[PDB]
Write a protein that binds this ligand. Structure first.
Ligand code: CLA
Ligand code: CLA
Ligand code: CLA
Ligand code: CLA
Ligand code: CLA
Ligand code: CLA
Ligand code: CLA
Ligand SMILES: CCCCCCCCCCCCCCCC(=O)OC[C@H](CO[C@@H]1O[C@H](CS(=O)(=O)O)[C@@H](O)[C@H](O)[C@H]1O)OC(=O)CCCCCCCCCCCCCCC
Ligand SMILES: CCCCCCCCCCCCCCCC(=O)OC[C@H](COP(=O)(O)OC[C@@H](O)CO)OC(=O)CCCCCCCCCCCCCCC
Ligand SMILES: CC1=C(C#C/C(C)=C/C=C/C(C)=C/C=C/C=C(C)/C=C/C=C(C)/C=C/C2=C(C)CCCC2(C)C)C(C)(C)C[C@H](O)C1
Ligand SMILES: CC1=C(C#C/C(C)=C/C=C/C(C)=C/C=C/C=C(C)/C=C/C=C(C)/C=C/C2=C(C)CCCC2(C)C)C(C)(C)C[C@H](O)C1
Lengths: 187, 172, 32
C-alpha cells in the first residue's frame, strides 16, 4: 500500500538480491533468502531434481493404486516400500539411481563452474523443444510449475494416507473425515 | 500532548500515527520505533479479530460445532480445541504466515522501505487515497487499543464469572 | 535376513553417508 519497490508475488517483501528474473518460474518469492546464502544455480538444480522426482512420484502414487503389475503383489504403495525393501528390488533402484547421480554430481560441479545450465542434462530425444527456442522457456516454466505442484501433491497424498489409511483413488470416492469426527464428542 | 507534567521521549516527536506523547516508562528509548509500531499494530489487529470473534461466538455458532465442542466457550473452548486440532491448525498456518511477517520485519529494520504494519493487504482498493488512508490508520490504531482492552476485559470476565460476553453484560 | 554389507540397511546408510560427503563440497562452493 505504501510506495516502494517490492516483489511481484509478495507485495510486502522486496525483490530478492539474487533473484534477478532470468531463471524461469521466478516470481521473486524468496522470503528467507536462501539465494543469498547459497548459489542460485545449485538451488535451481536441487529444485529441478526434487521436482522431477516428485513428478514421477505422483505418477507412481496414482498408478500403483490404479494398476499393479502381474508380478509383485496387490498392496498399497506406502507399505509397498517395505515390501520391495524386503524383496531386494528397491536396493537395485538405489544402485541404478546412484549410478545416474554419480554423473549428476559431475554435472552439478560443472554447473558451479558455469559450463552448463542448472538442471540441463541435454536430454531431449524427441526434440520437443530442442530446435525451437521460444518453446524452450515455455516448457521450462511449465516444467517448474509442474515440479512445485508435484512436490506439494506427493506430500499431500502421503500425509493423507498417513491419517486416513486409504488410497488416493479410494479417498476421492469414499471420502471419510479423520478420527471419527462425524459423530465425535469432547475431541 | 497526553500528560502535562511529564515530557515525551525524543523518539516521540510526531510524524507517527497516534503520537500524543504518551510513553512515561521510556520504551522507545531502548526499543526501535519500527518494531514498537509493528508490534502495536499486530496486537491491535489480533485483539480486534479476537474481540469480534468472541462476540460472534457468544451470539451465534456454526452448524454442528456444538455436537463436538459442547457448551464450552473461551478457555474451555481452547482446552477442547487444542485436543481437537483446530488450534493446532491455527498455530501452524499462522506461524507460517508469521514467517513472512518476520522477514518483512527484518527487511523493514534493515531498510527495505516498508512501514510498520504494512502487509499490502488492500482488497477492493478501500481507503487507499488522500487523507482517508491516514484517517483509517488513526481509526485502526485507536480501535486496536480499544479492542485490546476489551479483549482483556472479556477474558477476565470469563475468568471471574464463567460466562460469555453477551450474557455477562445482561445478567449482572 | 541379509546382514552386513549385503543388508539394505547398510545400503541406505551408505547413500546417506555419500549424501553428506557430497553435501560438504557442493554447498561449500554454493556458499563461496
Ligand atoms: C540391463 C540392466 C539390468 C539388469 C541385468 C537387471 C537385473 C535384475 N533386476 Mg533390475 N533394474 C535395472 C536394470 C537391470 N536390472 C534398472 C535400470 C532399474 C530401474 C532403477 C531396475 C529396477 C529393478 C527392480 C525394481 C527390480 C529389479 C530386479 C532385477 C532382478 C530380477 C531379474 C529377473 O529374474 O527378471 C526376469 C526378467 C524377465 C522375465 C524379463 C521381463 C521383465 C519385465 C516384464 C520387464 C519390465 C517391465 C517394466 C519396465 C517394469 C535381476 C537381478 C528385481 C529383483 O530384485 O529381483 C528379486 C526387482 O524387483 N530391477
Ligand atoms: C510435464 C512435465 C515436464 C515438462 C514440461 C518438461 C520439460 C522439459 N524437460 Mg523434463 N522431465 C520431466 C518432466 C517434464 N519436463 C520428468 C518427469 C523427468 C524425469 C524423467 C524429466 C527429465 C528431464 C531431463 C533429464 C531433461 C529434461 C529437459 C527438459 C526441457 C527440454 C526437453 C523437452 O522439450 O521436454 C518437453 C517435455 C514435454 C512436452 C512433456 C512431455 C510429457 C509426457 C507426454 C508425459 C508422459 C506420459 C505419462 C504417462 C503421464 C523441457 C523444458 C532437458 C533440459 O533440462 O533441457 C533444458 C533435460 O536434459 N527433463
Ligand atoms: C495439491 C495440494 C493439496 C490438496 C488439493 C489437498 C487436499 C486435501 N487435503 Mg491435504 N496436504 C497437502 C496438500 C494438499 N491437500 C500437503 C502439502 C500436505 C502436507 C502437510 C497435506 C496434508 C494433509 C493432511 C494431514 C490431511 C489432508 C487432508 C486433505 C483433504 C481435506 C481438505 C481439508 O480439510 O482442507 C483435502 C482433499 C485431510 C484428509 O485426509 O481429508 C480427510 C488430512 O487429514 N492434507
Ligand atoms: C509459532 C509460530 C510463530 C512464529 C515463529 C511467530 C513469529 C513472530 N511473531 Mg507471532 N504469532 C503467532 C505465531 C508465530 N509468530 C500466532 C499463532 C499468533 C496469534 C496467537 C501470533 C501473534 C503475534 C503478536 C501479537 C506479535 C507476534 C510477533 C512476532 C514476531 C516477534 C516474535 C519474537 O521475537 O518473540 C515474529 C515475527 C510480535 C511482532 O511482530 O513484534 C514486532 C507481536 O507483537 N506474533
Ligand atoms: C482472531 C481470533 C479468533 C480465534 C482464536 C478463533 C478461534 C475459534 N473460533 Mg472464531 N471467529 C473469529 C476469530 C477467531 N476465532 C472471527 C473474527 C469471527 C467472525 C467471522 C469468528 C467466528 C466464529 C464462529 C461463528 C465460530 C467460531 C468458532 C471458533 C472455535 C472453533 C474454530 C473455528 O472454526 O473457527 C472459525 C473462525 C472463523 C471462521 C473466523 C475466520 C475469519 C476471520 C476473518 C479470521 C475456535 C476456538 C466456533 C466455536 O465457537 O465453536 C464452538 C464457531 O462456531 N468463530
Ligand atoms: C467453518 C464453518 C463451518 C461450516 C459452514 C460447517 C458446516 C456444516 N457442518 Mg460443521 N464443523 C465446523 C465448522 C463448520 N461446519 C467445525 C469447526 C467443527 C468442529 C467442532 C465442525 C463439526 C461438525 C460435526 C461434528 C458435524 C458438522 C456438520 C455440518 C453440516 C451440517 C448440515 C446442516 O445443518 O446443513 C454443515 C455442512 C454435521 C454433518 O453432517 O457433517 C458431516 C456434523 O455432524 N460439523
Ligand atoms: C475497522 C478496523 C480497521 C481499520 C480502520 C483498518 C485500516 C487499515 N488497514 Mg487494517 N486490519 C484490521 C482492521 C482495520 N484496519 C484487522 C482486524 C486486521 C486483521 C485481519 C487488519 C489487517 C490489515 C493488513 C494485513 C493490512 C491492513 C491495512 C490497512 C490500511 C489500508 C487498508 C484500508 O483502508 O482498509 C480499510 C478497512 C476498513 C474500513 C475496515 C472495515 C471493517 C469491516 C466492515 C468489518 C466487517 C464486519 C465485522 C463482522 C465487524 C488501513 C489504515 C494495510 C496497510 O497497512 O496499508 C497501509 C495492510 O496491508 N490491515
Ligand atoms: C536472526 C535474525 C537476524 O536478525 O539476522 C538477519 C538475517 C535475516 O535477514 C535476511 O535478509 C534477506 C534480505 S537481504 O539479505 O538484506 O537482501 C531476507 O531474505 C531475509 O530477511 C533474511 O534472509 O538473519 C537470518 O534470519 C538468516 C535467514 C534464515 C534463513 C537463511 C536461508 C538459508 C538457510 C541456511
Ligand atoms: C532367500 C532368497 C534366495 C534363495 C537362495 C537361492 C540361491 C542361493 C544363493 C545365495 C543367495 C544370495 C547370496 O549370495 O547371499 C550370500 C551372501 C554373501 O554375503 P557375504 O558373506 O559376502 O557378506 C558378509 C557381509 O558381512 C559383507 O561382507 O550372504 C549374505 O550375507 C546373505 C546370507 C543370506 C542370509 C543368511 C541369514
Ligand atoms: C483492512 C481491510 C479490510 C478489512 C477488514 C477487517 C476484517 C476489519 C476488521 C475490523 C475489526 C474486526 C474491528 C474490531 C473491533 C473490535 C472492538 C473495537 C472490540 C469489541 C469488543 C467490545 C466492545 C467488548 C465489549 C464488552 C462486552 C461485550 C461485555 C463486557 C464488557 C466489554 C468487555 C467492554 C477490508 C476487508 C475491508 C478490505 C480493505 O481493503 C482491507
Ligand atoms: C492463560 C490462559 C488463557 C488465556 C488468556 C488470555 C488471553 C489472557 C489475557 C490476559 C490479558 C489480555 C490481560 C490484559 C488486561 C489489560 C490490561 C491489564 C490493561 C488495561 C488498560 C488500562 C488499564 C489502561 C489504562 C490507562 C492508560 C495506560 C492510558 C490512559 C489512562 C488509562 C485509561 C487509565 C487461555 C484462554 C489460553 C486458556 C488457558 O487455559 C489459560
Amino acid at each position: 500500500v505504501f510506495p516502494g519497490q517490492f516483489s511481484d508475488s509478495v507485495p510486502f517483501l522486496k525483490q530478492p538480491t539474487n533473484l534477478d528474473g532470468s531463471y524461469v518460474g521466478d516470481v521473486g518469492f524468496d522470503p528467507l533468502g536462501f539465494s543469498d546464502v547459497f548459489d542460485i544455480r545449485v538451488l535451481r538444480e536441487a529444485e529441478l531434481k526434487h521436482g522431477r522426482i516428485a513428478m514421477l512420484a505422483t505418477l507412481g502414487m496414482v498408478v500403483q493404486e490404479a494398476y499393479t503389475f502381474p508380478f509383485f503383489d496387490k498392496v498399497l504403495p506406502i507399505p509397498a516400500h517395505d515390501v520391495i525393501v524386503k524383496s531386494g528390488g528397491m536396493s537395485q533402484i538405489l544402485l541404478w539411481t546412484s549410478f545416474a547421480e554419480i554423473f549428476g554430481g559431475i554435472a552439478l560441479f560443472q554447473t558451479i563452474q558455469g559450463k552448463r545450465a542448472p538442471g540441463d542434462y541435454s536430454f531431449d530425444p524427441l526434440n520437443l523443444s530442442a530446435n525451437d527456442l521460444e518453446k524452450r522457456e515455455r516448457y521450462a516454466l511449465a516444467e517448474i510449475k509442474h515440479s512445485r505442484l508435484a512436490m506439494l501433491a506427493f506430500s499431500g497424498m502421503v500425509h493423507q494416507y498417513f491419517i486416513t489409511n486409504q488410497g488416493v483413488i479410494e479417498q476421492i470416492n469414499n471420502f471419510r473425515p479423520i478420527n471419527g469426527f462425524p459423530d465425535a464428542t469432547f475431541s | 500532548q497526553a500528560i502535562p507534567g511529564s515530557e515525551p521521549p525524543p523518539a516521540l516527536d510526531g510524524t507517527w500515527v497516534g503520537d500524543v506523547g504518551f510513553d512515561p516508562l521510556g520504551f522507545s528509548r531502548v526499543i526501535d520505533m519500527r518494531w514498537l509500531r509493528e508490534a502495536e499494530l499486530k496486537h491491535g489487529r489480533v485483539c480486534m479479530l479476537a474481540a469480534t470473534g468472541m462476540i460472534v461466538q457468544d451470539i451465534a455458532l456454526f452448524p454442528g460445532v456444538t455436537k463436538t465442542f459442547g457448551p464450552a466457550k473461551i478457555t474451555a473452548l481452547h482446552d477442547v480445541a487444542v485436543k481437537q486440532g483446530s488450534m493446532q491448525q491455527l498455530l501452524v498456518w499462522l506461524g507460517f504466515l508469521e514467517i513472512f511477517g518476520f522477514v518483512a520485519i527484518v527487511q523493514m529494520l534493515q531498510g527495505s522501505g516498508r512501514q510498520p504494519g504494512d502487509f499490502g493487504f488492500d482488497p477492493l482498493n478501500c481507503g487507499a487515497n488522500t487523507d482517508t488512508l491516514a484517517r483509517r490508520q488513526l481509526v485502526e490504531l485507536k480501535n486496536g487499543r480499544l479492542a485490546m482492552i476489551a479483549t482483556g476485559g472479556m477474558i477476565h470476565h470469563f475468568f471471574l464469572t464463567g460466562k460469555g460476553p453477551i450474557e455477562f453484560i445482561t445478567t449482572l | 535376513e541379509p546382514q552386513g554389507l549385503t543388508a539394505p540397511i547398510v545400503h541406505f546408510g551408505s547413500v546417506i553417508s555419500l549424501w553428506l560427503l557430497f553435501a560438504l563440497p557442493v554447498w561449500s562452493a554454493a556458499y563461496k
